[PDB]
Design a binder for this molecule. Structure first.
Ligand SMILES: *[C@@H]1O[C@H](CO[C@@H]2O[C@@H](C)[C@@H](O)[C@@H](O)[C@@H]2O)[C@@H](O[C@@H]2O[C@H](CO)[C@@H](O)[C@H](O)[C@H]2NC(C)=O)[C@H](O)[C@H]1NC(C)=O
Ligand SMILES: *[C@H]1O[C@H](CO)[C@@H](O)[C@H](O)[C@@H]1O
Ligand SMILES: *[C@H]1O[C@H](CO)[C@@H](O)[C@H](O)[C@@H]1O
Ligand SMILES: [Ca+2]
Ligand SMILES: [Ca+2]
Ligand SMILES: [Ca+2]
Ligand SMILES: [Ca+2]
Ligand SMILES: [Ca+2]
Ligand SMILES: [Ca+2]
Ligand SMILES: [Ca+2]
Length: 320
């Protein structure tokens, strides 16, 4: 039997030439040399392009391997119309051959890898758009879902439109930290709903840009040293070493005294802003003061500039 009004057959994508599509002669109620006597033929050479109608067997068969996505593309139903012509008397039957889709085509991305720059200060809940894959197959044989590589910081949300199209996007849950790791590498994978499933990948290399979120810190919180009375000027007391983990200018430092630092201390001690070398500039004396406290600070060359602090305790010795 056929569909009310028209004749219809089914054939599979990429099937080898010679495959039986359907017996036109029998289904059209003909037997014997009627076929040859009636000049049973396909309507045009476009019908005989993808098909052959034998005058002997009366069988409509595949004459050429048919790639459905080259004929219908993104069409759900692929009905290929052919015109079976018979003469004596002349009649025309319009037969429609549906090309059933095969899951022979794999999901693909435009680019094998993607590079994303994301600020360290990226707040949780931040959605970042991703490349969408393509699967020329139709139905469930096209892209079904996306999977992201297991990681600590990124989840995957896929917006599913009414039509069924998928849109993958990264959702940030745990705040990135460049000082921990600056590059996160994930693999976005697109999988179609066929069995067995076919896949495509896109290598997303997230780059964490530096934010000045770290103040400089000294190797020791408090430093207690000694300095003999009447120690000759030009003497190197010590060298300060503070370090900042941030990159570039955000990691470069400048050494200085505290704002509140006494003028007496400034007169006695000098401090190199670049190296962190604390020299004694003026002659110190025990009978003037017993103990000095130098508030040292190291400031970032970033915006805004941050600063760490260290207390240098100077015990002066007694002589006479
Ligand atoms: C002593 O200081 C060195 C140098 O620190 C660098 O110079 C500072 C002025 C500031 O710009 C820092 O951010 C610099 O790192 C420290 O050695 C560095 O250690 C880091 C640690 O990862 C390393 O990346 C650098 O290459 C090192 N630089 C050199 C020249 O060795 C060192 O850690 C400090 N020591 C102490 C005990 O704090
Ligand atoms: C393609 O291959 C991936 C692994 O790379 C599978 O996870 C997927 O189901 C498809 O078979
Ligand atoms: C996605 O990842 C796969 C390996 O998982 C690669 O073969 C592909 O080229 C793409 O980078
Ligand atoms: Ca195909
Ligand atoms: Ca196909
Ligand atoms: Ca597919
Ligand atoms: Ca950080
Ligand atoms: Ca940082
Ligand atoms: Ca910093
Ligand atoms: Ca003295």
């Amino acid at each position: 039997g056929w569909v009310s009004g028209q004749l219809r057959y089914s054939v599979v994508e990429e099937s080898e030439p010679g495959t039986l599509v359907g017996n036109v002669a029998q289904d059209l109620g003909l037997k014997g040399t009627d076929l040859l006597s009636r000049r049973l033929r396909l309507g045009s050479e476009e019908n005989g392009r993808y098909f052959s109608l034998s005058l002997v067997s009366g069988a409509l068969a595949v004459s050429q391997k048919i790639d459905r996505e080259s004929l219908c593309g993104a069409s759900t139903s692929c009905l290929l119309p052919v015109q079976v012509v018979t003469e004596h008397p002349l009649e025309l039957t319009r037969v429609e051959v549906e090309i059933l889709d095969l899951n022979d085509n794999s999901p693909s991305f435009a680019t094998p890898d993607r590079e994303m720059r994301i600020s360290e200060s990226a707040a949780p809940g931040a959605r970042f758009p991703l490349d969408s894959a393509q699967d020329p197959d139709v139905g469930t044989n096209t892209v079904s879902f996306y999977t992201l590589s297991p990681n600590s910081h990124f989840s995957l949300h896929v917006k599913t439109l009414k039509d069924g199209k998928l849109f993958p996007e990264l959702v940030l849950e745990q705040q990135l930290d460049r000082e921990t790791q600056a590059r996160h590498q994930l693999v976005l994978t697109a999988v179609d709903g066929g069995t067995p499933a076919r896949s495509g990948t896109s290598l997303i290399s997230v780059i964490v840009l530096d934010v000045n979120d770290n103040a400089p810190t000294f190797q020791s919180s408090v430093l207690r040293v000694g300095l003999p009375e009447n120690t000759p000027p030009g003497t190197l007391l010590l060298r300060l070493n503070a370090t900042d983990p941030d990159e570039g200018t955000n990691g470069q430092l400048d050494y200085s005294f505290g704002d509140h630092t006494s003028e007496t201390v400034k007169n006695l001690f000098g401090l190199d802003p670049s190296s962190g070398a604390i020299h004694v500039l003026g002659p110190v004396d025990f009978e003037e003061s017993n103990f000095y406290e130098i508030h040292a600070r190291a400031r970032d060359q970033g915006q805004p500039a941050m600063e760490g602090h260290c207390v240098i305790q100077v015990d002066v010795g007694d002589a006479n």
